């Protein structure tokens, strides 16, 4: 009922260069080489966020173009819609009380400024600044994730303040995203000679 992500879910907690050294730290993490959530909702569940959520979308032809992260829809606080044109970020909500989920006819869609392709994301928000992580690797097994090792890095720290718990996304006019709740754990990391993470070890897995 619970697979392993194997070596998935490793990101730089802070960012200070090191070389040919071994470092350890404690922070919120998805547990390593453990009872990872093979989502036994049986693969596309919808769940709240709590303290942390890991994300990994299985999208290849951009069947779903725009992620929507609503939280409560209480008409009061906000719902930030960030769709990126690789140059800009939309800061808008589509909230003046029009419908929220549109459909493909073959609910406002305006824009503003700010498996050979694996898009993986970690959505962590730090006292206003939202840490957004990304990567791009190819795979061959069409069914599930591989056992390989990779490193994940963040992109931006945009400072406004907004939470994201209970959301669902779709397109506009004209997946097995494993919700891995972040948990506090102590980890050891391995740095190569070039300042690139190459290995990691969980401490509480086994003696």
């Amino acid at each position: 009922a619970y697979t392993n992500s194997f070596t998935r879910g490793v990101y730089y907690p802070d960012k200070v260069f090191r070389s040919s050294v071994l470092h350890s730290t404690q922070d919120l993490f998805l547990p390593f080489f453990s009872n990872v959530t093979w989502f036994h909702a049986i693969d596309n569940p919808v769940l709240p966020f709590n303290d942390g959520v890991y994300f990994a979308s299985t999208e290849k032809s951009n069947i779903i173009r725009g992620w929507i992260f609503g939280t409560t829809l209480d008409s009061k606080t906000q719902s930030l819609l960030i769709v990126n044109n690789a140059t800009n970020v939309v800061i808008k909500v589509c909230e003046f009380q029009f419908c929220n989920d549109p459909f493909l006819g073959v609910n406002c869609t305006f824009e503003y400024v700010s498996f050979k392709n694996l898009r993986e994301f970690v959505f962590k928000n730090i006292d206003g600044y939202f840490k957004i992580y990304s990567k791009h690797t190819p795979i061959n097994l069409v069914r599930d994730l591989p056992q390989g090792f990779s490193a994940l890095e963040p992109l931006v720290d945009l400072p406004i303040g907004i939470n994201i718990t209970r959301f669902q996304t779709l397109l506009a006019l004209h997946a097995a995203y494993y919700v891995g709740y972040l948990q506090p754990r102590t980890f050891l990391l391995k740095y190569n000679e070039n300042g690139t993470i190459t290995d990691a070890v969980d401490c509480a897995l086994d003696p």
Binding site: V16, F49, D74, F96, Y112, D127, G128, I160, N163
Partner: protein, 408 residues
């Protein structure tokens, strides 16, 4: 010579070598060389907005590329409190810091001093994914005449007392509830059901903390290998190969900035070494990486014979290159006041690295190399043997301690 006399608390110094003090290369100047973003906008238009777009539809804007007479506001030096414990005092004042946030509220004037986590309301209970990310020493202030009006802004709220436990700084816009209830009154009264409304009173005689403000927005990042963002100041030209006090990206120190070779990935904030000290910093204008090397220092040792007959002395510097301060250079350090000869004797006064000095004839201290002793060889052959014929007697002497005194 007189320093040794002071250090020995005596008027007669015997033959030998002694240590007096530690010589430190004096820091010459101080340099502040920060990277250039050519703009310092977000202090006047950001901190005090005029119109406040609804938080529910927040419209960010990259407020930058402007210059004004901002020095008027912050030219004052009335910053008093620095109380945030643990850290030792030396070198904060030149930090370019990252994170700042607060709230602006009509807090129920009965509670002025309870701005703390653990409350309800659209801003207090549920807005944001907030960890336990506390880095910095708190900032707060008041402003009445320039911006606000007496009476308050009815937007956001904090508290300390509700019907049950409030939802403590899971300030997470979701409507999750921390449940501490047993039975519902369903909005109607009866047996053991308090009145949900209460009379606190809109009075001017209560606390003043029912008054309006607004808080700030600032964008700064933490990153790994060369970016080009943090510096506000008119920066001097960087002085290479000089032991000066520096100031880069927030942290100061004294040393020499040199050329590096570490190939990198362009998302920097700061670089550090193995021993928790800073290894290398990054170019202010360009994408280059600069190193940091601490300035020199070392102890001072005095070499001299006894003062019974001679007054001349000499000085030794340990572990310092000679060019950085008669002069002679040795692997043990820099030697001053000695003469180098082409001869070998046995040791008189030890120095180090197989070098010994002595007072010899006109008379001065001279340094020479080790000499183990005389050489000998014996004619060996397959049919030779030596035999003694006469003998002698000799007597020696040895000394050994046995005990000492007893006290209580």
């Amino acid at each position: 010579l007189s320093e040794t006399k002071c250090t020995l608390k005596s008027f007669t110094v015997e033959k030998g070598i002694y240590q007096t003090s530690n010589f430190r290369v004096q820091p010459t100047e101080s340099i502040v060389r920060f990277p250039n973003i050519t703009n310092l906008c977000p202090f006047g238009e950001v901190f005090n907005a005029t119109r406040f777009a609804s938080v529910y539809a927040w419209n960010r804007k990259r407020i930058s590329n402007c210059v004004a007479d901002y020095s008027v506001l912050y030219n004052s030096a009335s910053f008093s409190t620095f109380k945030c414990y643990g850290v030792s005092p030396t070198k904060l004042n030149d930090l370019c810091f990252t994170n700042v946030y607060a709230d602006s509220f009509v807090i129920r004037g009965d509670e002025v001093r309870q701005i703390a986590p653990g409350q309800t309301g659209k801003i207090a209970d549920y807005n944001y994914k907030l960890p336990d990310d506390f880095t910095g020493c708190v900032i707060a202030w008041n402003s009445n005449n320039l911006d606000s009006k007496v009476g308050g802004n009815y937007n956001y709220l904090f508290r300390l007392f509700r019907k049950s436990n409030l939802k403590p700084f899971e300030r997470d816009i979701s409507t999750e509830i921390y449940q501490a209830g047993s039975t519902p009154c369903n909005g109607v009264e009866g047996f053991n059901c308090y009145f949900p409304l209460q009379s606190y009173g809109f009075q001017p005689t209560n606390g003043v903390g029912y008054q309006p403000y607004r808080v700030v927005v600032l964008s700064f990042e933490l990153l790994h290998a060369p970016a080009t963002v943090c510096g506000p100041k008119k920066s001097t030209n960087l002085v290479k190969n000089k032991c000066v006090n520096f100031n880069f990206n927030g942290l100061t120190g004294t040393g020499v900035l040199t050329e590096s070779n570490k190939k990198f990935l362009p998302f920097q904030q700061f670089g550090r070494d193995i021993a928790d000290t800073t290894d290398a910093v990054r170019d202010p204008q360009t994408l280059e990486i600069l190193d940091i090397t601490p300035c020199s220092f070392g102890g001072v040792s005095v070499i001299t014979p006894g003062t019974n007959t001679s007054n001349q002395v000499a000085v030794l510097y340990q572990g310092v290159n000679c060019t950085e301060v008669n002069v002679f250079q040795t692997r043990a350090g820099c030697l001053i006041g000695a003469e180098h000869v082409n001869n070998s004797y046995e040791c008189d006064i030890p120095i180090g690295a197989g070098i010994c000095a002595s007072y010899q004839t006109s008379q001065s201290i001279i340094a020479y190399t080790m000499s183990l002793g005389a050489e000998n060889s014996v004619a060996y052959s397959n049919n030779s043997i030596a035999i003694p014929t006469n003998f002698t007697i000799s007597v020696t002497t040895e000394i050994l301690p046995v005990s000492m005194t007893k006290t209580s």
